[PDB]
Design a protein around this ligand. Sequence first.
Ligand SMILES: Cc1cc(N)nc2ccc(N)cc12
Ligand SMILES: Cc1cc(N)nc2ccc(N)cc12
Lengths: 238, 238
Amino acid sequence: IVGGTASVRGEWPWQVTLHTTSPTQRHLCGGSIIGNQWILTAAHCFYGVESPKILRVYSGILNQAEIAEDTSFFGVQEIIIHDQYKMAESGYDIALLKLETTVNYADSQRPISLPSKGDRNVIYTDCWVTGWGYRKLRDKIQNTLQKAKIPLVTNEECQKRYRGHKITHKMICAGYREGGKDACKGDSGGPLSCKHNEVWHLVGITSWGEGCAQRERPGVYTNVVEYVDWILEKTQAV
Amino acid sequence: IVGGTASVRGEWPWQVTLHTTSPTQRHLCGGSIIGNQWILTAAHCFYGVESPKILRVYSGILNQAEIAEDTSFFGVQEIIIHDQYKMAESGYDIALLKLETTVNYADSQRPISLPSKGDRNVIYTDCWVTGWGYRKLRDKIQNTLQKAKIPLVTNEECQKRYRGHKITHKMICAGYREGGKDACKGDSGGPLSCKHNEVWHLVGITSWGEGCAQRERPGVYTNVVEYVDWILEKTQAV
Ligand SMILES: Cc1cc(N)nc2ccc(N)cc12
Ligand SMILES: Cc1cc(N)nc2ccc(N)cc12
């Protein structure tokens, strides 16, 4: 996160850190708790990941320093990548992790509500991007979970800023015209969370951008509401 | 290493990477193989290290990417810190690791000779600093073992550049007047290796500097030849 600040412990209790154990353990991506056995994240996070066995999901984390060999985590039973996904910049940058065990909800770990198709008309004015990602393009993973409040921009405006891309209705963009606050490397898969009528909604999934927090380059996010049917389909038993 | 280049595999076969496993595994410091059971490194590397159980020594490494949960390593049986050590900037920045098992020497892993008291008169003109450390003050650990050729400077000259310090005869300095090449964070404990009469000698141990590779700020190293009696004393059996 560029231009963000340190979060209060547990103020983003749906936020997880997804680690890979290969070759040695490190943060890979963000993700969001959306069900007792389900994390929603970005498909592009799994580039070169050949098995869910190397993945660990940590909930209730503020600082990466909390994670040691003796820290409890959730194993991943299955990675579900959208079948239309090719790469982040083409859209469909969405994936589910089915956990091996179920999350016991508590103040530090609980699910975020999905947006409603009826909220497509809502103007979200209180949106935040969160993660342990870079503070600038060439940087490193941060210890303390960072937060930044970022305004949504229209898809029409976003298309103006990405003339070599097709910014689709399955994407949503957020950023300041002058830049300064944005997701960056390592924030991928985390939430764009918007509070509306006292409820937090998972509006976006951090996906891509040209650089981080540059002027006239909004961050691009997966438009979660366009995938509520897919999420329902994929999270049913057998 | 600032201003360095990628090493050829095994061209520094005495160079080890010392990892800590706490809280999760990461490179901590460099070190040098000097005996079948002995690594020479910097005392300051062990700040807050309460037990040798959390340490792993990896030999024969070029890229950190080689190190996975299944990669062989040497355990540490004992950390021996010089009894006069207080901090890097005051000198005595020297420590031995006694390994749990012995190193089987090969082209990729073998010991470096210690300097002779009779070489105190030698002008070393072919000295190199090596490590996986930062490329600049605020950076991160590098994948490929880096090397930089750096000229020794006189202690008189070094003292000129560090007016708030006492640069002692138990220290040795190296750097360009214009800067640009130097050790940096994460290179600590590694060798300053000088080739003289076709033999590599362990002249220094990377210790400290004000910033990395700054103009008129030579890197400061432990002057290994001043500790050959100590090394002998500490590496004897019971
Ligand atoms: C995830 C992400 C978002 C963004 N807005 N910019 C980025 C730039 C580089 C990168 N590797 C990832 C990025
Ligand atoms: C080990 C080391 C050497 C040097 N020449 N400069 C440094 C600067 C900062 C730091 N943390 C370590 C350094």
